[PDB]
């Protein structure tokens, strides 16, 4: 899998070499739990996590042998019963971090997908419309071999939720 829960409201997607991006996945999971236990769940934010990966990546690249051929996206939504815009961060292999207002595209040829999304994107699109837009711009496919998950802001605590199988087929 290339999409994962990181913390209550913080999700994570990656593209590159599976063992490495997977390894970062694990490191990120690790940091959040300990931090929450020391202070609290609502103190871990998508921003702090996005920052940790970048610093680690830069130091690691400078002192290691081969750079991590990975591209990361950390996502965050608001808590239950609160209003706030979703935040997307993209962390690149060197340590660079970019704040995205609408969408992130990672891995492969990013130009055509990024442009198709540029024409099709609509704020406050429902789940089905955003799924159609995302699959369409991704094609620039079949029901099989698709990994789809959401950070549903309406859930009480754990926002991450996979959308697989028959329900996904019905939606598409």
């Amino acid at each position: 899998q290339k999409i994962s829960e990181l913390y209550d409201r913080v999700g994570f997607a990656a593209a590159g070499k599976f063992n490495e991006f997977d390894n970062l996945r694990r490191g990120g999971i690790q940091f959040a739990d300990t931090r929450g236990y020391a202070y609290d769940r609502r103190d871990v934010t998508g921003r702090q996590l996005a920052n940790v990966y970048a610093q680690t990546l830069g130091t690691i690249f400078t002192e290691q042998a081969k750079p991590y051929e990975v591209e990361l996206c950390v996502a965050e939504v608001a808590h239950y019963g609160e209003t706030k815009r979703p935040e997307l961060y993209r962390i690149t292999y060197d340590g660079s971090i970019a704040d995205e207002p609408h969408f992130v595209v990672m891995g492969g040829t990013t130009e055509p997908i990024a442009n198709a999304l540029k024409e099709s994107y609509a704020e406050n699109a429902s789940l089905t419309d955003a799924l159609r837009i995302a699959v369409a711009a991704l094609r620039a496919l079949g029901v099989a071999s698709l990994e789809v998950a959401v950070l549903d802001a309406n859930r009480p605590r754990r926002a991450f939720r996979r959308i697989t199988g028959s329900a996904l087929q019905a939606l598409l």
């Binding site: 829960e5 694990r26 999971i29 739990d33 236990y37």
Partner: protein, 222 residues
Amino acid sequence: TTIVALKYPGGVVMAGDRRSTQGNMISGRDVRKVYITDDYTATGIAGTAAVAVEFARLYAVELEHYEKLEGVPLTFAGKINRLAIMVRGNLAAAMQGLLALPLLAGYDIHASDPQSAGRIVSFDAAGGWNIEEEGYQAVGSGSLFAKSSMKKLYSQVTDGDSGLRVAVEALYDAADDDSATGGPDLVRGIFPTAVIIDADGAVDVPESRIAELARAIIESRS
């Protein structure tokens, strides 16, 4: 303190009183001693208040942590084991006086028969555990009175609600014969807390239901 747990056909119920003392002095009138550690297990802890709340918190964290790493909850056996290892770890401090004993209620989703998937597990200070099979358990200073009450009242348990009433009554007798266990305070409106676990997970019993059961018992005894 006193925490009872009993299986009923199709589920498990776990209730606990509210008092916390220092010697003869009543120091807390509304402590909550029964936690929902996860969607299918509740944990009561008798003993030192600090060690108790800490156990509950840390155990919940660990269950959920493994669940996030592996993508699937532990089996009921693994949960039993981790709780046991924590308890065994507190043994040095328990000899120094900081003793905390947990009683673990769970609903095994993987069991064969749903009507008997309920599970009650008891621990000693040395981390050994035992899967109770006579249908009920209790822990704390009032545990003996509570068990001797449930032994007689247990043939009345036939569903979730009757099982809940039997739990509340057992607590009432614990408090009736021991001073460290608080009974239903009709003046301040503070009643025992209860958790029900069945096929659909764990939910806290809302206070009103416990209030009505307690008032029924109290009027029955007058």
